[PDB]
Design a binder for this molecule. Structure first.
Ligand code: CLA
Ligand code: CLA
Ligand code: CLA
Ligand code: CLA
Ligand code: CLA
Ligand code: CLA
Ligand code: CLA
Ligand SMILES: C=Cc1c(C)c2cc3nc(c4c5[nH]c(cc6nc(cc1[nH]2)C(C)=C6CC)c(C)c5C(=O)[C@@H]4C(=O)OC)[C@@H](CCC(=O)OC/C=C(\C)CCC[C@@H](C)CCC[C@H](C)CCCC(C)C)[C@@H]3C
Ligand SMILES: CC1=C(/C=C/C(C)=C/C=C/C(C)=C/C=C/C=C(C)/C=C/C=C(C)/C=C/C2=C(C)CCCC2(C)C)C(C)(C)CCC1
Ligand SMILES: CC1=C(/C=C/C(C)=C/C=C/C(C)=C/C=C/C=C(C)/C=C/C=C(C)/C=C/C2=C(C)CCCC2(C)C)C(C)(C)CCC1
Ligand SMILES: CC1=C(/C=C/C(C)=C/C=C/C(C)=C/C=C/C=C(C)/C=C/C=C(C)/C=C/C2=C(C)CCCC2(C)C)C(C)(C)CCC1
Lengths: 28, 496, 34, 65, 37, 77, 56, 38, 341, 35
């Protein structure tokens, strides 16, 4: 119940890492 | 352009839409009041008030309804215990329905003021751009505030045409709704005197009338108008936040320390009554006064109400129970059923021992049985390898007087240990834990919840106050332009 | 151990409501450019 | 604009809008009311705190007695 | 009605989404331990 | 004006090399004559406890507080 | 109206404040129109201290 | 800033004398405390 | 010109130090607080309000002295000199801990004067008063722990006494009774303060190593001291380094220097909320699941249960003489011990 | 009638009056000499 919630929130942090590195806003 | 923290800055330069928004906020507040009312009228239990009152059940708005004179129900009950009452329209369900329709009307007027936003009243026609007359506004509204304060004091509180207010005795046994006379002597600043409250609302009301007329009939002087930068709606807000957090701080303290306008039959004991061992001294006073007139212990302890003993139960402090313990106090230890009776421990020598009660500071506290002067004469050993005092070397017996157990005596060490273990809480009660599936871990009363909420909102409104106080005095640097200057229309050069 | 049925609802709302709020503002200001 | 009946009635109530009486005015009179209020707050704070005891007043629950 | 002249748009760029979402999801991980108890 | 220049100016020296020792000695005598103990109500180190008592002096009432200290001091506690 | 903040290409709004203006000494019409209100005020607060004496 | 003429009382003057005179009294107190026999 | 304006201009003259209107509240209150502490750690006892010794006169070193709080039998008293408990007698007033309230209240007024001083200087120079806003973090901390918390407990006795070891005692008392480290708001505070120091070091190093004209015989001279820097280095260099190491960097200098302001300030504010929560004795001490599992199963041990055992020990062995006005006496077979488990 | 604590409050506000009276008095005097 609780632990699935914990690992899901973890998984979306590390996904957000990936998104911030390889898809940053082009500053123009 | 606006960030997510500048979206409501498009009302600054037009009052029509500002009022639309303000009406809307008001609709939501009245709706929440009504909706919350109805919800906890579905969990309130009116059969038993003496060992199951509202503040044990975590009622939040019921104490604020009860404090001013709403007590009935159209379902035929009352919070006093009176069954078959005739309340008329004004009962809990009535005020709830009232607030919900009040919200409906407010929501409609808010809609009205949003679609129609261009009304020449808000403009000033000499330049045809929006402005307010802020001193005149404060005056008008002070006149209204004063007259309403005067009326509320003079007709409702007095019981002159209204019902009066909630009055109690010092121990919170017999309290009820009754009229109150005003008191303007130097005993009217006694903050445990109802009369001071009636005096205050009349008097404050008259000040409001006087000042309200005054601010219509005098304009501001120039030095203040330029100093405090009036004519800028963002400074009214700056002042109001300061006032509002002053008020929250002082009600936080008045709720936590107690006053006559926060009774202990609607908000439960304060923690300062447990520290001073208030009800305990009263119980002993009654017991010695009954023994002195001739009595044995059984009769003497049978003549103490259940209610007076219930307050000497530490489970009613608003200073037990933590932040992420959520539920009524009844979730905490279950619902009380009965008073076991006063427990007296004695050794086999015969001498009467006294159980040292637990401060509020701890989560767990030893059981150390002390005699008359203060020397330890028995104890429950934490060790399981070592004892010099135990309930097998000092042979302590518990005897019960009053309550369910009149004259019961246990002399078997484990049962006597269990009684000592739950008698550092004070008086011993029978609980039913299956109804809520309680866990035995403490919970705080509504009082603690209220004061905590308001003591943190006040501290946040401090930062609010400084931020807005800055944005009005440093307005000429947050924007590059000065409102002193009217926008520039025509350029002159100077070039070699 | 007793784990709350309502602890899960607090968790669920706590993330989902602000996330969809910010996302809607973002797609709104993206259609502001194109 | 929207010419409407209640707006015209309230029109003269918002028509000064920036007018001010010359110089200091009643600032020295404000300061008198202001000071009295602060002294009032100290009196009613110290009574509550039991730092100012005025005979015939008893600051406890037992005044509902 | 006649259009409001005080109508301005609202912005939120991508890096603010990343930051903001991080804060939301992180704050959830800290307080979820206490909600579940 | 730099502080270095006024500190080594003759006007400073002529008054201050007379007043500086006076202050140092006034402090020294405030302690050495036993007066420091009598002004700040700090007990002498042979006298924190009475003969009879082995318990500390402790205040237990706020309006009869000075009365309780006056009593504790007569019994030489 | 207020167009501000090229820091990110952004907006911030602030109030438009009226101009200041030194009062003109009152006309006799202004004096008598004011007189009704203050006279009403005088008797109104008298009457309310009267109700106050009655309700105790 | 403050005129070089420097009349006897000056903002600077009181500032350096409310941090000079008590300290020379107090350091003379502490020094005497060092020779008190326990 | 009228007397008010002459006075006002003279308060705003060009001096070594600015006095200003805010100075009028600032300087007496600050001086008297600071002197009050200096005369207290040097002469004033605590022998009648804690049974401890904390003075150079009594004989103690720099770390163990304090100006100590009043007793628990004084309640929430303001402790005026002319009030009805010292009744105008200096010796009693120092003995009863009245010097504690002197420092606390005068120091609150010194802090108010100081934030007002920051506003006043900002407005006469004409800069934004952001440094005053930054200074609301100390005030939040101070009014929550030295004023709001004791006004919730039972007296000023649990207010934090001014002193080195006296504050070290506060830490153990909080660790043992409230379990402060497990509260989430303090968790957020620790992260914020360490995060502020983190940005301090990184900024300080990466500006120092990317300067324009670190050789070249620097032909820039101004300075322009109020800039502080923030053109003596190339932003493009910095960005281009960090964006490869950590995979993210700033690209806007303004927002960097606002993030530096944002982080440690938000930290202290969250902790200030946390401790005003403790004033009502609303704490998180335990997780209810762990307690029921541990009651049902005693073969269950975690690092958290362990913390509970340690806290249980701190309280019982420190309390009988930390709180002597409770008169606890605990036999040595009831005090907690690990070897009894 | 008067209680001792009430005299104490009177003492208190009289020292308050004195110390603010003095501070603004000397500051008004000092400013208006060297204006
Ligand atoms: C902590 C700092 C702080 C700061 C930066 C501000 C900033 C400001 N306030 Mg605010 N204010 C504060 C605290 C503060 N306030 C507090 C705590 C209160 C009480 C709730 C107020 C209530 C207040 C109001 C209601 C208003 C202001 C206004 C103002 C602005 C006007 C000019 C000014 O400088 O006044 C600063 C002057 C003061 C704060 C006066 C200090 C008074 C003292 C020293 C009282 C001492 C009494 C007595 C001698 C000792 C008591 C002893 C005690 C133990 C009993 C402004 C900059 C106005 C505003 O919004 O401007 C836009 C306005 O409407 N102030
Ligand atoms: C900026 C100046 C300043 C400020 C803000 C403070 C602030 C404070 N001082 Mg203080 N003090 C100062 C300078 C200052 N000090 C100086 C220079 C001295 C040395 C002489 C002292 C010496 C001193 C002592 C020794 C003590 C304090 C105390 C106090 C505090 C307690 C509150 C109190 O008693 O209020 C007093 C204020 C009032 C009663 C308000 C006075 C209001 C006036 C002036 C109006 C009167 C108008 C009119 C005549 C009234 C008519 C009334 C009638 C209608 C009934 C407060 C923290 C005490 C303390 O901290 O206790 C914990 C304490 O022991 N002060
Ligand atoms: C139209 C009149 C009206 C009436 C008669 C009521 C009547 C009631 N409301 Mg209510 N309410 C109204 C409109 C009204 N409502 C509106 C418009 C709102 C939305 C903003 C609300 C929102 C509201 C809430 C949220 C709640 C109630 C509640 C209640 C009930 C309990 C008593 C109570 O809480 O009093 C207590 C009232 C006070 C303590 C008021 C204190 C006022 C302050 C501090 C004013 C100080 C500022 C002043 C200007 C200072 C200067 C004064 C000057 C003269 C000198 C009572 C039956 C409660 C309830 O049980 O609802 C079911 C509740 O929680 N009301
Ligand atoms: C703001 C003031 C306030 C206060 C003091 C209370 C107090 C009360 N409410 Mg309550 N309530 C409020 C507003 C408030 N309410 C509002 C606005 C809502 C509508 C959404 C509710 C909804 C509500 C429900 C649903 C119930 C109550 C109940 C109760 C009572 C039972 C005790 C309890 O379970 O506490 C619970 C305490 C709270 C709800 C507030 C404290 C919350 C926690 C633990 C954390 C707060 C911080 C949070 C994690 C966010 C952190 C963010 C971070 C970034 C800083 C208690 C007396 C219960 C009841 O009727 O019992 C019979 C019940 O079931 N109330
Ligand atoms: C009391 C009334 C009040 C009013 C009328 C305003 C009005 C305003 N403030 Mg202010 N403010 C207040 C209180 C108030 N504030 C308080 C208490 C604080 C201290 C935290 C601040 C701190 C503050 C800052 C620091 C800033 C503003 C800004 C703004 C403006 C921006 C628009 C906006 O709505 O934000 C848009 C909406 C959001 C930011 C979303 C908030 C989501 C939250 C956190 C709450 C969700 C609802 C909440 C749980 C409901 C319960 C409320 C509770 C108090 C009972 C606006 C004109 C900004 C400004 O000046 O712009 C130029 C700016 O920089 N305010
Ligand atoms: C003969 C007429 C008369 C009488 C008998 C009263 C009687 C009363 N008035 Mg009063 N009053 C009157 C006329 C009268 N008034 C008039 C004409 C005015 C002006 C219009 C006022 C203005 C007034 C005010 C301003 C207040 C009262 C309050 C009160 C009552 C509360 C007593 C109490 O509980 O203290 C309770 C509390 C205190 C004495 C503490 C005051 C605290 C101060 C001033 C500072 C706050 C500092 C800071 C922001 C807090 C930080 C807290 C943090 C550390 C935890 C009492 C019923 C008070 C009230 O409603 O309290 C609930 C309140 O604040 N009245
Ligand atoms: C290891 C990491 C760590 C870190 C980073 C922190 C971080 C923090 N802790 Mg700590 N803490 C920790 C571990 C840690 N904690 C542990 C393990 C415990 C054991 C239980 C505690 C127990 C603890 C307690 C009990 C408290 C904190 C508090 C604080 C915070 C307040 C900021 C501060 O220091 O205020 C320090 C003080 C101030 C900012 C006030 C400054 C006052 C002024 C400006 C005085 C004037 C100075 C000077 C004389 C003027 C000079 C003039 C001259 C230059 C001209 C901060 C969030 C406090 C807190 O959160 O309160 C809100 C608090 O009450 N902590
Ligand atoms: C314990 C840690 C700590 C200390 C010691 C401290 C100290 C100080 N912070 C100041 C400022 C600030 N601090 C800031 C953020 C922070 N400050 C923090 C933590 C601290 N800050 C943290 C963590 C932050 C990050 C958010 C900012 C942003 C500012 C400033 O802008 C400001 C400044 O000017 O910095 C240079 C200075 C105010 C100078 C002044 O004119 O005082 C005015 C007050 C005076 C003169 C006296 C006040 C009253 C007294 C005497 C009572 C206290 C008790 C006595 C000192 C007795 C001794 C106590 C013992 C425990 C030793 C001062 C040096
Ligand atoms: C239209 C109409 C109508 C109807 C209406 C209605 C139906 C209403 C209702 C209303 C309502 C019914 C409303 C409600 C609202 C609510 C709210 C508004 C709430 C809020 C909340 C909050 C704000 C919270 C917060 C919090 C949380 C969440 C957690 C923690 C704590 C706190 C407090 C922070 C009628 C028919 C009558 C009439 C005609 C018309
Ligand atoms: C005080 C008092 C009282 C009460 C009163 C009241 C409360 C009143 C009311 C008032 C109000 C509160 C009112 C309101 C109203 C509103 C309205 C009237 C609205 C309207 C609107 C409309 C009509 C709209 C329309 C629209 C639009 C605009 C858009 C779209 C949609 C629609 C179409 C819908 C009583 C009796 C108890 C007595 C004593 C005193
Ligand atoms: C309490 C009181 C009061 C006040 C008084 C005062 C205000 C005092 C002052 C006092 C003071 C104000 C003192 C001072 C002291 C100081 C000292 C004692 C110093 C020392 C120093 C040194 C020795 C140095 C050291 C060092 C450092 C710091 C750093 C580095 C290292 C070295 C080693 C160099 C009055 C009368 C109001 C009222 C009644 C009570």
């Amino acid at each position: 119940m609780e632990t699935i919630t914990y690992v899901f929130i973890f998984a979306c942090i590390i996904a957000l890492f990936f998104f911030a590195i390889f898809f940053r806003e082009p500053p123009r | 352009g606006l960030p997510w923290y500048r979206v409501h800055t498009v009302l600054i330069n037009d009052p029509g839409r500002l009022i639309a928004a303000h009406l809307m906020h008001t609709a939501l507040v009245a709706g929440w009041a009504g909706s919350m009312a109805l919800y906890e009228l579905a969990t309130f239990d009116p059969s038993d008030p003496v060992l199951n009152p509202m503040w044990r059940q975590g009622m939040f708005v019921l104490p604020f309804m009860a404090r001013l004179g709403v007590t009935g129900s159209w379902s035929g009950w009352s919070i006093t215990g009176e069954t078959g009452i005739d309340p008329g329209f004004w009962s809990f369900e009535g005020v709830a329905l009232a607030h919900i329709v009040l919200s409906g009307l407010l929501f409609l007027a808010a809609c009205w003021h949003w679609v129609y936003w261009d009304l020449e009243l808000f403009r000033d026609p000499r330049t045809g751009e929006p402005a307010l007359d802020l001193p005149k506004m404060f005056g008008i509204h002070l006149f209204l505030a004063g007259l309403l304060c005067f009326g509320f004091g003079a007709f409702h509180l007095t019981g002159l045409f209204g019902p009066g207010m909630w009055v109690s005795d010092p121990y919170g046994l017999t309290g009820s709704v009754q009229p109150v006379a005003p008191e303007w002597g130097p005993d009217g600043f006694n903050p445990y005197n109802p009369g001071g409250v009636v005096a205050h609302h009349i008097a404050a009301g008259i000040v409001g009338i006087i000042a309200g007329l005054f601010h219509i009939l005098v304009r501001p002087p120039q030095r203040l108008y330029k100093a405090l930068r009036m004519g800028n709606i963002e400074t009214v807000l700056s002042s109001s936040i300061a006032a509002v957090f002053f008020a929250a701080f002082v009600v936080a303290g008045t709720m936590w320390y107690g006053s006559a306008t926060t009774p202990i039959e609607l908000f439960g004991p304060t923690r300062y009554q447990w520290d001073s061992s208030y009800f305990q001294q009263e119980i002993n006073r009654r017991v010695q006064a009954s023994l002195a007139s001739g009595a044995t212990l059984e009769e003497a302890w049978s003549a103490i109400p259940e209610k007076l003993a219930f307050y000497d139960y530490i489970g009613n402090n608003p200073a037990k129970g933590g932040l992420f313990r959520t539920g009524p106090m009844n979730k905490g230890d279950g619902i009380a059923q009965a008073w076991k009776g006063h427990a007296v421990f004695r050794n086999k020598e015969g001498e009467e021992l006294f159980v040292r009660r637990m401060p509020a500071f701890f989560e767990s506290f030893p059981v150390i049985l002390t005699d008359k002067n203060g020397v330890v004469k028995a104890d429950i050993p934490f060790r399981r390898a070592e004892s010099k005092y135990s309930f097998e070397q000092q042979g302590v017996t518990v005897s019960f007087y009053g309550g369910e157990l009149n004259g019961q005596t246990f002399t078997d060490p484990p049962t006597v240990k269990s009684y000592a273990r739950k008698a550092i809480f004070g008086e011993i009660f029978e609980f039913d834990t299956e109804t809520l599936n309680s866990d035995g871990i403490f919970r705080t009363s509504p009082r603690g919840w209220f004061t905590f909420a308001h003591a943190v909102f006040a501290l946040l409104f401090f930062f609010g106050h400084i931020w807005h106080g800055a944005r009005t005095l440093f307005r000429d640097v947050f924007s590059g332009i000065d409102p002193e200057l009217s926008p520039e229309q025509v350029e002159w050069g100077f070039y070699q | 151990m007793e784990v709350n049925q309502l602890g899960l609802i607090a968790t669920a709302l706590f993330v989902l409501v602000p996330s969809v709020f910010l996302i809607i503002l973002y797609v709104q200001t993206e259609s502001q450019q194109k | 604009a929207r010419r409407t009946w209640l707006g015209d009635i309230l029109r003269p109530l918002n028509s000064e809008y920036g007018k001010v009486a010359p110089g200091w005015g009643t600032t020295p009179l404000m300061a008198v009311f202001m000071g009295l209020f602060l002294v009032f707050l100290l009196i009613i704070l110290e009574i509550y705190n039991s730092t100012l005891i005025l005979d015939g007043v008893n600051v406890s629950w037992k005044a509902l007695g | 009605m006649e259009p409001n002249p005080n109508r301005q748009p609202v912005e939120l760029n991508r890096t603010s989404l990343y930051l903001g979402l991080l804060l939301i999801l992180v704050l959830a991980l800290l307080f979820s331990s206490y909600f579940f108890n | 004006r730099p502080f270095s220049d006024i500190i080594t100016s003759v006007r400073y020296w002529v008054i201050h090399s007379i007043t500086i020792p006076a202050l140092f000695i006034a402090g020294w005598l405030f302690v050495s004559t036993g007066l420091a103990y009598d002004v700040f109500g700090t007990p002498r180190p042979d006298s924190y406890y009475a003969q009879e008592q082995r318990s500390i002096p402790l205040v237990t009432d706020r309006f009869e507080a000075k009365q309780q200290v006056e009593t504790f001091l007569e019994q030489l506690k | 109206m207020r167009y501000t903040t090229d820091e990110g290409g952004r907006l911030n709004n602030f109030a438009i404040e009226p101009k200041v203006y030194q009062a003109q000494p009152w006309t006799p019409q202004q004096k008598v129109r004011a007189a009704l209100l203050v006279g009403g005020g005088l008797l109104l607060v008298a009457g309310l201290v009267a109700i106050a004496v009655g309700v105790s | 800033q403050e005129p070089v003429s420097y009349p006897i009382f000056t903002v600077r003057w009181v500032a350096v004398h409310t941090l000079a005179v008590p300290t020379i009294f107090f350091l003379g107190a502490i020094a005497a405390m060092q020779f008190i026999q326990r | 010109r009228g007397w008010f304006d002459i006075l006002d201009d003279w308060l705003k003259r060009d001096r070594f130090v600015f006095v200003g209107w805010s100075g009028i509240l600032l300087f007496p209150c600050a001086y008297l607080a600071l002197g009050g502490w200096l005369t207290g750690t040097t002469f004033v006892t605590s022998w009648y309000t804690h049974g401890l010794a904390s003075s150079y006169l009594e004989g103690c070193n720099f770390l163990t002295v304090a100006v100590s709080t009043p007793a628990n039998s004084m309640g929430h008293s303001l402790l005026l000199l002319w009030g009805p408990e010292a009744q105008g007698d200096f010796t009693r007033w120092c003995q009863l801990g009245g010097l504690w309230t002197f420092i606390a209240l005068h120091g609150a007024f010194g802090l108010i004067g100081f934030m007002l001083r920051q506003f006043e200087i900002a407005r006469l120079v004409g800069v934004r008063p952001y440094n005053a806003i930054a200074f609301s973090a100390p005030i939040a901390v101070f009014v929550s722990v030295f004023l709001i918390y004791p006004l919730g407990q039972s007296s000023w006795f649990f207010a934090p006494s001014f002193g080195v070891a006296a504050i070290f005692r506060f830490l153990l008392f909080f660790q043992g009774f409230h379990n402060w480290t497990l509260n989430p708001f303090h968790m957020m505070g620790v992260a914020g303060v360490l995060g502020g120091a983190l940005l301090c070091a990184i900024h300080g190093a990466t500006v120092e190593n990317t300067l324009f004209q670190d050789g070249e015989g620097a032909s820039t001279f101004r300075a322009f001291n109020p800039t502080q820097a923030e053109e003596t280095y190339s932003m493009v260099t910095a960005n281009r380094f960090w964006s490869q190491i950590f995979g993210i960097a700033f690209s806007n200098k303004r927002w960097l220097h606002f993030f530096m302001l944002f982080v440690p300030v938000t930290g202290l504010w969250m902790s200030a909320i946390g401790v005003v929560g403790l004033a009502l004795n609303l704490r998180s001490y335990d997780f209810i699941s762990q307690e029921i599992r541990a009651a049902e199963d005693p073969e269950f041990e975690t690092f958290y249960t362990k913390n509970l055992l340690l806290n249980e020990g701190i309280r019982a062995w420190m309390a009988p003489q930390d709180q002597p006005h409770e008169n606890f006496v605990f036999p040595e077979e009831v005090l907690p011990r690990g070897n009894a488990l | 009638t008067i209680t001792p604590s009430l005299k104490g409050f009177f003492i208190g506000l009289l020292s308050g009056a004195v110390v603010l009276g003095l501070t603004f008095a000397v500051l008004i005097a000092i400013s208006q000499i060297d204006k």
